[PDB]
PDB file of C-alpha atoms in Angstrom:
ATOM      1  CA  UNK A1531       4.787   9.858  -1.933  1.00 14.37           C
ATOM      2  CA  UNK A1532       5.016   6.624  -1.506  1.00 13.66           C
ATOM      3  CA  UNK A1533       3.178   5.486  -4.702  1.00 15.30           C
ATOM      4  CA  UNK A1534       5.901   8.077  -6.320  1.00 13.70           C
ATOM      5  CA  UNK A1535       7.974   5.235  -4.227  1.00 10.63           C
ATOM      6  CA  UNK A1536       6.320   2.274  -5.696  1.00 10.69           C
ATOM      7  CA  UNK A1537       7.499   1.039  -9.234  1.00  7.45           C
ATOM      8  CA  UNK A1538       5.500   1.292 -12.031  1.00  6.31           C
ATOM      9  CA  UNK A1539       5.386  -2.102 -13.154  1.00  2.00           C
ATOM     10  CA  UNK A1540       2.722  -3.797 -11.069  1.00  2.52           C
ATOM     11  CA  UNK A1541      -0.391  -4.468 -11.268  1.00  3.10           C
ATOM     12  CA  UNK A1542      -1.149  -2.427  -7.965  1.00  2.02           C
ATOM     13  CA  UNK A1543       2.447  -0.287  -9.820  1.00  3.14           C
ATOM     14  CA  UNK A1544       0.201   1.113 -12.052  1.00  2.00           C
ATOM     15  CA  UNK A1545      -2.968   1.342 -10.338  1.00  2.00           C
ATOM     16  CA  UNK A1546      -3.194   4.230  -7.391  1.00  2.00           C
ATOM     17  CA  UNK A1547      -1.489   5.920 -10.373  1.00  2.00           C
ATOM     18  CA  UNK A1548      -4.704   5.920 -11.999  1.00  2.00           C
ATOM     19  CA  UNK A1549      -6.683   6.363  -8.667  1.00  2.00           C
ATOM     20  CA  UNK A1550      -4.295   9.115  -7.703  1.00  2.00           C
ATOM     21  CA  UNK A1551      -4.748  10.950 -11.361  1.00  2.00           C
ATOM     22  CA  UNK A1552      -8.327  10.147 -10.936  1.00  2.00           C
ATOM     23  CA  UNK A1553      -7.663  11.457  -7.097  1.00  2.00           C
ATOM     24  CA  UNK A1554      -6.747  13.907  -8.575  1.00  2.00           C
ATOM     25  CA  UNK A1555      -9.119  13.677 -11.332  1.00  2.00           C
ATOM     26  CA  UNK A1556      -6.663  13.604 -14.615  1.00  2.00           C
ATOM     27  CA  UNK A1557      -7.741  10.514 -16.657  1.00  2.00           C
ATOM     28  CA  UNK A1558      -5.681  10.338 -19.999  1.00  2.00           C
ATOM     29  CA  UNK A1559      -2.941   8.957 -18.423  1.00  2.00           C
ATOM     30  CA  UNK A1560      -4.750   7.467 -15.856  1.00  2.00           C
ATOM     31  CA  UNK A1561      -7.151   6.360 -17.970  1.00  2.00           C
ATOM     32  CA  UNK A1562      -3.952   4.796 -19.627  1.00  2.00           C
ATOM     33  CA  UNK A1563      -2.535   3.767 -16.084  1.00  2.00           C
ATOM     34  CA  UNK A1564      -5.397   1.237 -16.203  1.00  2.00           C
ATOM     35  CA  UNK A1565      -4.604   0.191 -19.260  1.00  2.00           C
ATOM     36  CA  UNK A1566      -1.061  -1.061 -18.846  1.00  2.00           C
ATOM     37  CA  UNK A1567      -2.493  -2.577 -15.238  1.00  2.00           C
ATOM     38  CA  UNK A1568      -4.692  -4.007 -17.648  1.00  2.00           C
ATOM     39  CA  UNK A1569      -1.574  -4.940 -19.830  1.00  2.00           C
ATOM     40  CA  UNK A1570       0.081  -6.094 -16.758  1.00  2.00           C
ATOM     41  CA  UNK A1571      -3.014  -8.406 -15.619  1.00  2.00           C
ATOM     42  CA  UNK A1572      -3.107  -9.037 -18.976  1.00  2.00           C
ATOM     43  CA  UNK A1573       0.251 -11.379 -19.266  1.00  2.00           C
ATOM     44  CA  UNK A1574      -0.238 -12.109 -15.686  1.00  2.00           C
ATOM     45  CA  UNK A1575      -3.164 -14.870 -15.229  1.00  2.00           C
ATOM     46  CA  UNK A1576      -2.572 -15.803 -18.808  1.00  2.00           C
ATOM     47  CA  UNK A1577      -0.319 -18.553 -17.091  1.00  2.00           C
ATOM     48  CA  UNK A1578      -4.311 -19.559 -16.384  1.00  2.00           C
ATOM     49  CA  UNK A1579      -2.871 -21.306 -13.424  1.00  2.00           C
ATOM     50  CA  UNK A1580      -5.544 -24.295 -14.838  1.00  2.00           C
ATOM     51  CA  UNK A1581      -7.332 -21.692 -12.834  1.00  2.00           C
ATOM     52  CA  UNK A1582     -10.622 -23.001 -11.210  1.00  2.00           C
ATOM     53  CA  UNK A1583     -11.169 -20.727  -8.750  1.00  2.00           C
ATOM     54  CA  UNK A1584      -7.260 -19.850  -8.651  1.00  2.00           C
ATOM     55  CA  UNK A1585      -6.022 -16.386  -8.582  1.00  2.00           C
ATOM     56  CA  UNK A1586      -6.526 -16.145 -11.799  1.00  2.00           C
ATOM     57  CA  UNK A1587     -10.084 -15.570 -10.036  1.00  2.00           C
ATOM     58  CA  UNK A1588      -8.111 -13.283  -7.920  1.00  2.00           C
ATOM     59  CA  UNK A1589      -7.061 -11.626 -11.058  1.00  2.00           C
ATOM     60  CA  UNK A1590     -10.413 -11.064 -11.896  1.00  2.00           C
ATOM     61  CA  UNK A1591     -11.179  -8.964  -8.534  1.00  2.00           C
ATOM     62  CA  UNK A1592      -8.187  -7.243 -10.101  1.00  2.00           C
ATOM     63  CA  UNK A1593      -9.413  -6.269 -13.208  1.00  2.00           C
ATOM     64  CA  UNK A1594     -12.629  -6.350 -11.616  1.00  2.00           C
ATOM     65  CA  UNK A1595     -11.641  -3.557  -9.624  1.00  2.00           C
ATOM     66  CA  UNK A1596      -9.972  -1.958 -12.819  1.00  2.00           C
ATOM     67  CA  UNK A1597     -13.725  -2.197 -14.138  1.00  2.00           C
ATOM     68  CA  UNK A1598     -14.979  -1.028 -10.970  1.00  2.00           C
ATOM     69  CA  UNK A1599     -12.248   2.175 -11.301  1.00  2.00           C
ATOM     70  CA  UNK A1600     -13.058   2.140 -15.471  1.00  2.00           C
ATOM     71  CA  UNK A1601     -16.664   2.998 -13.849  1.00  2.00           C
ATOM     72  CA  UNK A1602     -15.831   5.645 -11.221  1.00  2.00           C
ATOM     73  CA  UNK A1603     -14.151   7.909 -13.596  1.00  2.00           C
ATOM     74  CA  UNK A1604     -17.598   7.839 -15.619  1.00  2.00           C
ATOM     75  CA  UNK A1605     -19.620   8.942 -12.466  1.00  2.00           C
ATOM     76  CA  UNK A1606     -17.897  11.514 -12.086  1.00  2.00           C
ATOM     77  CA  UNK A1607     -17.902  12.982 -15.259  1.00  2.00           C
ATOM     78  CA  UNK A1608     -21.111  11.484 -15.986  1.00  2.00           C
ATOM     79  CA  UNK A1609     -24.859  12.798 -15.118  1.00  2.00           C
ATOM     80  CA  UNK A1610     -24.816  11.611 -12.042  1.00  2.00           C
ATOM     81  CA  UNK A1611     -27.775   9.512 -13.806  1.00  2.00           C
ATOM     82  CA  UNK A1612     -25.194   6.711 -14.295  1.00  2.00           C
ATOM     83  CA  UNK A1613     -26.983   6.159 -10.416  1.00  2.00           C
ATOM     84  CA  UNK A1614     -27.717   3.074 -11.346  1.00  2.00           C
ATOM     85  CA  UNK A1615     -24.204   2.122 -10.959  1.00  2.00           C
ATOM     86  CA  UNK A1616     -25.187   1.763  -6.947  1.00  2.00           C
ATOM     87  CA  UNK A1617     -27.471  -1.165  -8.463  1.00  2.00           C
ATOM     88  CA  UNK A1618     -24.789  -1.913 -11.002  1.00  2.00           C
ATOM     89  CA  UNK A1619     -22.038  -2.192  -8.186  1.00  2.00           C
ATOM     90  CA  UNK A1620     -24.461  -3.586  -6.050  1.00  2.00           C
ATOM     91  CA  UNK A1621     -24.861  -6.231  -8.254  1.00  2.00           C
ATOM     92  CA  UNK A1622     -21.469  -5.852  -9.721  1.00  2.00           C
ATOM     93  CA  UNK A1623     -20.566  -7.054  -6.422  1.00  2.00           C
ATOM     94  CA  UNK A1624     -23.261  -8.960  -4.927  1.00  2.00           C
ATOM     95  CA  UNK A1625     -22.984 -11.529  -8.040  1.00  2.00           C
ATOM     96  CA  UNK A1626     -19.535 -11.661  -6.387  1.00  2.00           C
ATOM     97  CA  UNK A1627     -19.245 -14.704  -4.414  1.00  2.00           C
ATOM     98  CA  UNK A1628     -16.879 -13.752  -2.113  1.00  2.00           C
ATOM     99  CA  UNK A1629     -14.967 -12.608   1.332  1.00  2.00           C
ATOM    100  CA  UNK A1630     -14.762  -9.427   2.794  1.00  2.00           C
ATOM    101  CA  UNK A1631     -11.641  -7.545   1.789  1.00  2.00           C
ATOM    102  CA  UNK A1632     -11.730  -7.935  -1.314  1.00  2.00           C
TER     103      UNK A1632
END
């Protein structure tokens, strides 16, 4: 409902789109929901920000995340096989320095 309620224009504006599609596993669009949050990411941190570690960083957990959804949909929809991506995510995050809620 609410999502229904939020815009799509965001970077979260697309995105439980393509969770909820992928909730409710449809991944075309979805699959395309990413890519505009991609799009939208895209222009966003492009200001660079003279990131260091600036959200620009953030903006990679973003995308990070968008990653970390591009994988889901495979796992689902995979063979299962693609176990690994326990490991992967494990080190997909633990190579993340980082905090908690992200």
């Amino acid at each position: 409902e609410y999502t229904c309620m939020i815009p799509r224009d965001t970077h979260d504006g697309a995105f439980y789109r393509a969770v909820l599609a992928l909730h409710q596993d449809l991944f075309s669009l979805a699959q395309q929901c990413i890519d505009k949050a991609r799009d939208l990411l895209d222009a966003e941190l492009t200001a660079m920000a003279g990131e260091s570690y600036s959200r620009a960083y953030g903006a990679m957990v973003s995308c990070h995340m968008l990653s970390e959804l591009e994988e889901v949909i495979q796992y689902k929809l995979v063979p299962e096989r693609r176990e690994i991506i326990r490991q992967i995510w494990w080190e997909r995050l633990q190579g993340c320095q980082r905090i908690v809620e992200d």
